[PDB]
Symmetry: C3
Subunit: 277 residues, 3 copies
């Protein structure tokens, strides 16, 4: 039986930094000098609270803003609500999450579980256009009790005309072995719509990207249109029914793939070999 996420309700503490990178980008990190684009994955269970001690090491104001999770207005990360951070400053952002349940009026409160993301909201403009462009974005996963857990999680961000702010034709590539349970968090940012496509693999267009059983009527897809700040995720069994191979993933807008918004899902046999690669 597959590993599943247990019941949440833990108070978690975390440090985060925003940093200017040597190449002109901006990234988040859990440690000073280890900022990355995309920023590090934040993964919690429904019911967890997260207190993020956020330090802005940059010479301009910056913030942390999160989609999907519960936060009071004092943690919304906007200039309007006095929620961003001065250069060199520190602020504790609090993100909460809740489980689904019956309200007293008999309606059903949805839980926080899903594939979400965080990003800056004040660099360049009051909607963080410059911060997002420079790399201040990262993924958030909230698990429901009983959600299937993967062997590994990869984050793919279509940010304007880049994947993960990389130069075109430089991937990123990811690797797995036939049979691995691989999780993809797929986020879009910027100005343009995209369509995310994976060769050789498919998933369900629902909350978890997988079906629980035969009663779920969700479309099974391998291609999905996205726009700025959309987030979704899914899991696949690497090579299931198709075998090892260099499986391309790309934006399917023809000029986007033509310019190099493409990467490789490298699915290996145990000996590491990939047929035709």
């Amino acid at each position: 039986t597959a590993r599943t996420a247990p019941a949440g309700g833990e108070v978690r503490h975390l440090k985060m930094y925003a940093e200017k990178l040597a190449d002109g980008q901006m990234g988040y990190g859990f440690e000073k000098g280890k900022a990355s684009v995309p920023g590090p994955l934040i993964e919690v269970n429904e019911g967890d609270t997260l207190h993020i001690e956020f330090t802005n090491t940059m010479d301009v104001r910056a913030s942390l803003h999160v989609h999907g999770l519960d936060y009071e207005i004092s943690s919304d990360g906007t200039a309007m609500n006095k929620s961003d951070v001065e250069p060199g400053g520190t602020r504790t952002y609090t993100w909460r999450t809740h489980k689904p349940g019956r309200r007293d009026d008999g309606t059903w409160r949805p839980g926080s579980a899903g594939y979400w993301h965080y990003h800056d909201h004040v660099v360049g403009t009051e909607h963080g256009t410059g911060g997002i462009r420079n790399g201040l974005y990262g993924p958030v996963i909230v698990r429901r009790k009983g959600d299937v857990l993967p062997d590994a999680t990869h984050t793919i961000v279509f940010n304007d005309m880049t994947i993960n702010n990389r130069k075109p034709h430089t991937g990123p590539d990811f690797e797995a072995t036939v049979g691995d349970r691989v999780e993809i968090v797929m986020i879009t940012h910027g100005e343009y719509y995209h369509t995310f496509h994976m060769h050789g693999h498919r998933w369900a267009d629902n909350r978890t990207g997988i079906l629980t059983g035969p009663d779920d009527p969700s479309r099974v897809i391998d291609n999905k249109i996205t726009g700025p700040a959309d987030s979704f995720g899914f899991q696949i069994i690497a090579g299931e029914g198709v075998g090892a191979g260099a499986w391309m993933y790309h934006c399917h807008v023809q000029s986007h793939s033509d310019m190099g918004l493409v990467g490789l899902f490298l699915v290996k046999k145990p000996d590491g070999t990939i047929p035709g690669y």
Copy 2:
């Protein structure tokens, strides 16, 4: 227990007008001189019939065309089917709705319930491009028996590079008190794709925007890509788990929010105060 929509089947009569507005726009209204952009909300129960006595008070041909609801071709509101209205003329449009049910072949007929809209189809071009641009659009809600009813309904229309044809940076803003059940009808028109986003709140990507219980696998989202003539709706509990605040809603295409396609969901405490606002 929350208020729910009862079984439909009523024949309803309604007057509607299309009018040129003093500022050059065009709007629909239930009363001459009270046209609005967006036009007034039409809300019925599945099974209701609606006879709309429509008067075109303008100096150009205009029509009423509806998405989703049942109409015969004589009410489709197009020039092709001789269904538009001459200047100063009157025409009765008939919209019907039906409940879901079993067909005799054992398949399931879907009902009319959902978030829909109406708009002009002949001003400027034979697809109403000029009419839609000028403001001839409005929302339609069809309730299924047992659908949860809100405290209030707000209509948000991304029409080209405007919200509800307003100048950028002029909202609209909406207000609620913590705990209100607030309904949003979200319609898109024109030339451009958009992504609708709300701070501090989320909904289900399904027919009603809410989950009935734990078996619904729909994605819970706070960001949604839309294109011309898309319509969806949802309900939220204002401030649920997040408290009072000036909660922004905006298009998340970065240049769109930067140019001012943003508004405020003002969620107040009982004393009317909003923290940080």
Copy 3:
């Protein structure tokens, strides 16, 4: 009771050709000299295997690449994996499909069923941009056991600024009689997003486009945003609740319908007459 698809598991063999057309386009066909744009419909049952003996009759390299179905890397139809076809050459592509079922870890493997498509991947660029533009695309339907079968299937492809590569304002038009069960396969290709809309009809936004019964919460829609390589399908009862008529279907992006990306769903009475047409 409606006709339904039986259990699959047949090995099927098929010949296909890619041909240059006299007008400069490129099309697939099951017979030399009978290539079409879109290419012919491939319809199988979950569990079927399809061996396609593909001949490239053109003077440039070409390939067959399929979405959704199972194929080994040797059938992915890309130059990278040595999977395309030299001018005048022949290659057997193998597509497999599987039924859903329980994995040994207790998770649910999704089946292949759905609305899919095939297209070239090497004409013009290594993502088939030139091949797709010229007409090398076609529909694939994989049926699950018990899926409702239609009276007829029509394929509508929004390819850049054309429907099915036709000149604007030339349809295509389709015909049915009131009460026919009509299936639509709706595919998008190229550079641009679109919104597909049908007058007088609606469907469910799920795998089959129809609801099985009252428990399915999928949105019922008549308008849907699509991007390059999206595919979906649905069935409607022609004229159900609305009667005979010339029912327009069009892209609802206003400049797209204005330029003529529109066609007619001609729903006739038994005597062939169409009111207002």
